[PDB]
């Protein structure tokens, strides 16, 4: 049938990773999916605007990092950049 995608299973996995003995209602899972989509849209729009400012055809990790820096507040942006750099290096070190 209509096989439409969402983030519900990933949000649930993350929840069980942080809070094992805690569930989530369906309306809150909907809100979290909307939140993820919103933040994705904000970051991608900022990255696109930056790429077009700098005359580049590619969205790399530098654009994503600087869009994160532009969008999130200080400590939050710092932690997010730390996480992203950690993940990128761990993915690049292996193959």
């Amino acid at each position: 049938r209509s096989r439409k995608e969402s983030y519900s299973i990933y949000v649930y996995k993350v929840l069980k990773q942080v809070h094992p003995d805690t569930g989530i209602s369906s309306k809150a899972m909907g809100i979290m999916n909307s939140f993820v989509n919103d933040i994705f849209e904000r970051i991608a729009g900022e990255a696109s605007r930056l790429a077009h400012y700098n005359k580049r055809s590619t969205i790399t990790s530098r654009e994503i990092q600087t869009a994160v820096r532009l969008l999130l507040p200080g400590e939050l942006a710092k932690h997010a950049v730390s996480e992203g750099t950690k993940a990128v290096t761990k993915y690049t070190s292996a193959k």
Binding site: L15, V18, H19, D21, T22, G23, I24, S25, K27, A28, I31, M32, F35, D38, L71, L72, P73, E75, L76
Partner: protein
């Protein structure tokens, strides 16, 4: 994480939109980030002004 903390604070084992609203509006950085969004069934924070309190 913050929503699970807020839901345990209310002694619930399932997260509802109310706990998301409390977690968002209670965290300064998140509340600055999500400054324009409204959460259905999120409610408002309990806030009574100083001058309205009885005497």
């Amino acid at each position: 994480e913050l929503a699970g903390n807020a839901a345990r604070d209310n002694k619930k084992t399932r997260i509802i939109p109310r706990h998301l609203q409390l977690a968002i509006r209670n965290d300064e950085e998140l509340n600055k980030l999500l400054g324009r969004v409204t959460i259905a069934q999120g409610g408002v924070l309990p806030n009574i002004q100083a001058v309205l309190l009885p005497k």
